[PDB]
Design a protein around this ligand. Structure first.
Ligand SMILES: CC(=O)c1cccc(NC(=O)N2CCOCC2)c1
Length: 460
């Protein structure tokens, strides 16, 4: 029975509004309703992994697991295995997989982050799950960010706290936050970003939604605008939104948006908004294709509609050779030529690099680089031809060309990372000098760039 080189992943996010779900929620797992929907001809084909994020979830873990498993069994005639479930307050993540994957899944991690301080600490935050699927690392984050149209900056702060403090994936990757630890990272939830238009335009907005004319609304969506200005979710992707705003509905219909200020809303307007989102970030040159992104039309217990997204995602096998794992394969090497980091820092310490990769027995520290002044104020750290030759565990090009090198640039004075990035080994050529490049981030904000050349030797 061969190992897969692709899987499909279902991501669901639903703010349940503290209400039990209706008896049938299968449309959610089938990607049926509005937006980019799944073809009917696929309805019986199970996804490999289903990741369900809820917010304002009033159910016990047991109650929700029973509904989810019975839903999937009805659709697919497959009894899914529970990979992980984790709850913070009323924020929950469930991971289910086909039974055939049980012995492909390992290193399961769960964590949560509570956002805010005092007043603002007690119901918002995130839960997450990570695991290995054969040779591929997968991370999943369900966040419920701060509400309210005038709190986009708070949401952005909530995002940075979650990606700094959520402890998922390989703890040996110590310089790297969750935005660098996984082959594929999916981040979803009630992100709570709003359509920033004047209150007086509420009925105009509703009109536009009835005509399925979303362009002049999406141009004011705070998540799209904040992302464009590099304030949040830097280097993440989102599929085009082609479904109506998923908030705020009158319960038990979808015919009405309930936007007017009420005591129950803290006297805040809730203009129709795309609160409920799925984003992702995958390592460079790894296959990831969104095959659905939409909302259900027939699940009406909440003031939010469920959102679905599905993905084709490239995966690799758990590779064994005669040599690695357990030794190096002298027929393999990774060399770096003419490399330099450009950093936004005003500081003047020496810097060194760390190279981390599951193709190495352990991480590699470089010598200190040579600091120069850039012509526009910048710090340029030159490594020239000084970087160590990296010794992969396996030389087979079928393995090595699918790997990635994480790079941290660290202060000699403090050993703190000033920037993290990732280089793909999916090169156009081996035994050939080729340009490489990554942006560098720290706490998910841009801090610089790393560029140079690579020369990869495989056994072929
Ligand atoms: C740089 C930047 O972030 C940017 C800039 C312009 C447009 C978009 N569009 C999206 O992000 N979309 C399309 C609509 O539905 C969600 C995803 C993004």
């Amino acid at each position: 029975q061969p190992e897969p080189d692709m899987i499909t992943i279902f991501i669901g996010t639903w703010n349940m509004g503290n209400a039990p779900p209706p008896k049938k929620i299968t449309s959610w797992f089938l990607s049926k309703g509005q937006g980019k929907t799944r073809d009917d001809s696929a309805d019986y084909i199970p996804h490999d992994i289903y990741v369900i994020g809820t917010q304002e979830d009033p159910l016990s873990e047991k109650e929700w697991l029973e509904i989810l498993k019975h839903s999937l069994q009805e659709i697919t005639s497959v009894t899914f295995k529970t990979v992980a479930i984790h709850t913070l307050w009323n924020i929950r993540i469930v991971v289910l997989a086909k039974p055939e994957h049980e012995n492909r899944i390992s290193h399961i991690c769960t964590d949560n982050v509570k956002t805010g301080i005092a007043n603002t600490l007690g119901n918002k935050g995130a839960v997450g799950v990570s695991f290995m699927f054969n040779g591929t690392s997968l991370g999943f984050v369900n966040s419920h960010l701060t509400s309210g149209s005038e709190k986009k900056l708070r949401r952005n702060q909530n995002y940075m706290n979650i990606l700094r403090f959520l402890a998922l994936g390989d703890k040996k990757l110590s310089p790297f936050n969750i935005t660098h630890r996984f082959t594929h990272l999916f981040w979803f939830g009630d992100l709570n970003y709003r359509v920033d238009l004047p209150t007086w335009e509420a009925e105009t907005i509703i009109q536009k939604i009835k005509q399925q004319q979303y362009a002049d609304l999406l141009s004011h969506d705070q998540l799209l605008t904040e992302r464009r200005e590099q304030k949040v979710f830097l280097h993440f992707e989102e599929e085009e939104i082609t479904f109506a705003p998923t908030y705020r509905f009158e319960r038990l219909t979808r015919d009405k948006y309930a936007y007017t200020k009420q005591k129950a809303t803290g006297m805040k307007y809730n203009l129709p908004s795309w609160c409920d989102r799925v984003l992702w970030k995958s390592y460079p040159l790894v296959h990831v294709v969104c095959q659905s992104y939409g909302s259900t039309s027939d699940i009406m217990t909440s003031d939010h509609s469920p959102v679905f997204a599905t993905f084709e995602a490239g995966v690799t096998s758990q590779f064994v050779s005669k040599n690695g794992p357990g030794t190096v394969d002298s027929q393999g090497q990774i060399e770096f030529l003419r490399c330099y980091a450009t950093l936004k820092t005003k500081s003047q310490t020496k810097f060194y690099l760390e190279f981390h990769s599951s193709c190495l027995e352990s991480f590699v520290k470089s010598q200190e680089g040579e600091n120069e002044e850039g012509s526009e104020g910048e710090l340029v750290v030159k490594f020239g031809e000084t970087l160590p030759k990296l010794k992969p565990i396996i030389s087979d090009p079928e393995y090595l060309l699918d790997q990635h090198i994480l790079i941290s640039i660290k202060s000699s004075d403090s050993d703190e990372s000033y920037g993290e990035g990732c280089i793909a080994l999916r090169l156009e050529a081996t035994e050939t000098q080729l340009p490489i490049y990554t942006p560098l981030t720290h706490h998910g904000e841009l801090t610089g760039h790393f560029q140079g050349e690579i020369k990869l030797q495989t056994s072929q």
